[PDB]
Design a protein around this nucleic acid. Structure first.
Lengths: 177, 116, 74, 50, 136
RNA sequence: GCCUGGCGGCCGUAGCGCGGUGGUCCCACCUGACCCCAUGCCGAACUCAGAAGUGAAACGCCGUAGCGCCGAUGGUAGUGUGGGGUCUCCCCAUGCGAGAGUAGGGAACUGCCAGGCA
RNA sequence: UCCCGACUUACCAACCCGAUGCAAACUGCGAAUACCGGAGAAUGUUAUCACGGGAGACACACGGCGGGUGCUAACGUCCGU
RNA sequence: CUCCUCCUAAAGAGUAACGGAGGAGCACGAAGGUUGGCUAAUCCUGGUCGGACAUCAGGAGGUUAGUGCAAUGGCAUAAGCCAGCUUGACUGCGAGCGUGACGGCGCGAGCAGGUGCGAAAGCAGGUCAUAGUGAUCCGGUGGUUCUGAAUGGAAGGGCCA
RNA sequence: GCGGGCAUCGUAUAAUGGCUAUUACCUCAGCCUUCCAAGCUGAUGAUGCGGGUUCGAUUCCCGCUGCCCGCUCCA
């Protein structure tokens, strides 16, 4: 929302000088965020990856996507075509309303959250840290859930190296240790 | 990779118009303009062409690059071909979905008269 | 343990370049393509190229992949 | 081989039938298709997947 | 003895042995044992001449075997008729053309090498000469 | 006459890397999506509105041989015909003659609209 | 602190990089010949096709060339010519 | 012991051996038609459990993948992958060829009648192709106003499936 | 010249695709003065070794480490 409009004022005059950029189309923009639940408990049971999609259509706004398995493997007893993960992807102004809940709500409430990782970037400027708790998002609550399955959140931005990515999102007050 | 995908869709529909030897009305769409050519059955060079890039069809329009502008080109490329004696033309999507502006341009050539 | 082969399918080029063919004349029998159908030539379901029109047989490499085509020119 | 032969019989009342095969153990649904009847020269529904 | 660790096919045809060799220069060492005749070097012969070279140089200086026994020679048992399929693979040869560098050597003086390549040549069925490396 | 865009010819001497470079003329991202439309989730894509921004990415054009790619001449291999020598396998006469590799070439060349000084 | 592993072992050893070979079921190359078609002349008792009357023959052998098999044995065997 | 693929096989076709290797005796009402999209294997890194590998995100790579089933020829315009709607896995034919000693087998544009797909134009007579098969006789079952042993029927026969 | 398991201490299951299932042997425990006979309570399998195809092999496809019946003749 106004976190999206934080980009039009509070980052541009501030990240025009952190790397001495050429243009306003150079400022590292945030392209998409994907909310992966890798559910390796959906073969012997079927009534829970929908439960992983039950909250993901409440944590983020939209009907979640069941992913297939892409390859038959034996180390985890799955063939291909099987429901294995369930991800959601977020763009537009209804990703910064979600991203406001990862600066206002989420990072207060993580257990032993003495720090925020900074070496988690892939190398190209993409931050992908996941949370171990699906109790930390306040859209779903205490008398609701059976598992604590949790999820990943991969932040994708248009940076080039990862310290553009490190200094590309911390400007939205994403803290670090 | 918007152009690399689009010429991949067209290059099956560009064929069956070389192996058929049909006069191709080809449409090129872009965010703000809309283009059309009529090309001979050979692959060599065009017969008639029309777009919004000409200044005739520039300020006859409220805006360049919308469906009412595509119907401006739809009358324009068709009425300029019949005066050369070209009908029984085949429409080439050129990778665009026949839905929006390019539907509005082929619709406005079928009214003005181009035999498909 | 061995001993089996199959009947030979009589594949290959039946009308070579510069030969004048009637329409419907089989020009090459093949398994894959290895020869693509140019002008006045159909591909067929077993990829047997055949003359769609009377004329002379014409082989030419043409395309962004240097693929051998077969046209028919009257 | 382990597919039985069925007998697609027309709906047009004429005795014209097609014959085809069917996995009987996989698919027990009566296969019905709109095929051509040369006795009446219309496309009609063929039924009765034996 | 040398043998491929796996092959895609158990038996080969007999083939022929026409032509001249392609690896004809001393590539790695200084002194070579070039083949000047033509025949087949079984892996028993290549190994017998590999020991006879190494024992003559007293385990000193590097030794390359530039050929490899990669052809399976079959041989029908005794008292069996003709026919009844191809026989069973009994040894492995390298086909050798005139001009093939069989072995190579450096790290020893030349007169120890020409001595050691003379002891190896008496283990091979192929007339051989001693060649040294050439610039161009 | 350079510049851009469609369609081609052509199919690596045309590709790739590396470097420089271009703006509302065109093209690209880009603004927004409420509806036509649509995503097995996302206006990402497709699609529709309309130009606030930027030429960053893409995309052209210009550099550079780093890499592909192209590549003679001569020689060698092989070989048709003829005649010879002998385990195999060659040699002569004559005709054809590679592949590989060298020298070197090489940063493609070309038929419609539009733009701006002519 | 079995987690350290700093101290390094004539090392098992990828993938990559350089050099070197081999293949019949390898091919980013690629002949000679042969084969198809076309156009020419000379030559050949139509040699060429078709249709019909009558056949025989369907145990081949060796020699050159290209090969499979065999032992690059066989006056061996099995193909092509 | 029939069939398919490769090599032998001599750069057209063909070509033997108790020569060298493999496969078939099906599957599929979608795995067929069409229309609209799409593009892989592997690897690196990131890391809620998660490990070499489940899922997600990027980079590399460029088909090393995939092709219902062997191997070979193919395949990006994909013949690979996904959904929409569907029955052309149509009936009668078929110029013309290819291939066999023959029986036979194969390819086929086009025409006729109807039909499917396009919110327009623009294809389909089964599947990427090549194995998945059995002549005749004798019957069986439907259809057919073709024959119907004095005639009218019928039985039997024919023809079509 | 067929190929049947190459299965736990040992013997027999699971041989057209997971987890490994009987019976003895066994290590412990209780009865008995001590042994037995018991009756209870447990232990373990790269499923000979290593190759493929496989998503995955006791399972297939070959290898091939021995073996038990084989048949190796007509002169």
């Amino acid at each position: 929302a106004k976190l999206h409009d934080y980009y039009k004022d509070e980052v541009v005059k501030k990240l025009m000088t952190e790397f001495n950029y050429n243009s306003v189309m150079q400022v590292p923009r945030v392209e998409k965020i994907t909310l992966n639940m890798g559910v390796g408990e959906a073969i012997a049971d079927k009534k829970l990856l929908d439960n992983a999609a039950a909250d993901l259509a409440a944590i983020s706004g939209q009907k979640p996507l069941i992913t297939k398995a892409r390859k038959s493997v034996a180390g985890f007893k799955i063939r291909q075509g099987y429901p294995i993960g369930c991800k959601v992807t977020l763009r537009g102004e209804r990703m910064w309303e979600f991203f406001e809940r990862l600066i206002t709500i989420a990072v207060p409430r993580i257990r032993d959250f003495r720090g925020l990782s900074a070496k988690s970037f892939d190398g190209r400027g993409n931050y992908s840290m996941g949370v171990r708790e699906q109790i930390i998002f306040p859209e779903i609550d205490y008398d609701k859930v059976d598992r604590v399955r949790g999820l990943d959140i991969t932040i994708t931005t248009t940076a080039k190296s990862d310290e553009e990515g490190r200094a590309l999102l911390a400007a939205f007050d994403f803290p670090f240790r | 990779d918007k152009k690399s995908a689009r010429i991949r869709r067209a290059t099956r529909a560009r064929r069956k118009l070389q192996e058929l030897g049909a006069t191709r009305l080809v449409v090129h769409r872009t965010p703000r303009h809309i283009y059309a050519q009529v090309i001979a059955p050979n692959g060599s060079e065009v017969l008639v062409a029309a777009s919004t890039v000409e200044k005739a069809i520039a300020e006859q329009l409220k805006y360049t690059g919308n469906k009412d502008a595509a119907a401006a080109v739809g009358k324009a490329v068709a009425e300029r071909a019949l005066e050369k004696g070209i009908k029984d033309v085949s429409f080439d999507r050129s990778g665009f979905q026949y839905h929006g502006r390019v539907q509005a341009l082929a619709d406005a050539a079928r009214e003005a008269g181009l035999q498909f | 343990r061995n001993g089996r082969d199959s009947e030979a399918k009589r594949l290959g080029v039946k009308r070579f370049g510069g030969e004048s063919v009637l329409a419907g004349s089989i020009i090459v029998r093949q398994r894959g393509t290895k020869f693509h159908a140019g002008a006045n030539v159909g591909c067929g379901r077993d990829h047997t190229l055949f003359a769609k029109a009377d004329g002379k047989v014409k082989f030419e490499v043409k395309g962004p992949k240097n693929r051998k085509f077969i046209s028919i020119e009257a | 081989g382990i597919r039985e032969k069925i007998k697609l019989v027309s709906s047009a009342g004429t005795g014209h039938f097609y014959t085809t095969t069917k996995n009987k153990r996989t698919k027990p649904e009566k296969l019905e298709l709109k095929k051509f009847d040369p006795v009446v020269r219309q496309h009609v529904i063929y039924k009765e997947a034996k | 003895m040398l043998q491929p660790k796996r092959t895609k096919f158990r038996k080969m045809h007999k083939g022929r042995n026409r032509g001249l060799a392609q690896g004809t220069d001393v590539s790695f060492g200084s002194f070579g044992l070039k083949a000047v005749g033509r025949g087949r070097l079984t892996a028993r012969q290549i190994e017998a001449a590999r020991r006879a070279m190494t024992r003559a140089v007293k385990r000193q200086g590097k030794i390359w075997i530039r050929v490899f026994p990669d052809k399976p020679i079959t041989e029908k048992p005794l008292a069996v008729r003709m026919g009844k399929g191809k026989g069973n693979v009994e040894y492995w040869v390298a086909l050798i053309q005139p001009g093939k560098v069989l072995y190579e050597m450096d790290g020893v003086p030349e007169e120890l090498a020409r001595e050691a390549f003379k002891l190896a040549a008496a283990k091979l069925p192929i007339k051989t000469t001693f060649v040294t490396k050439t610039v161009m």
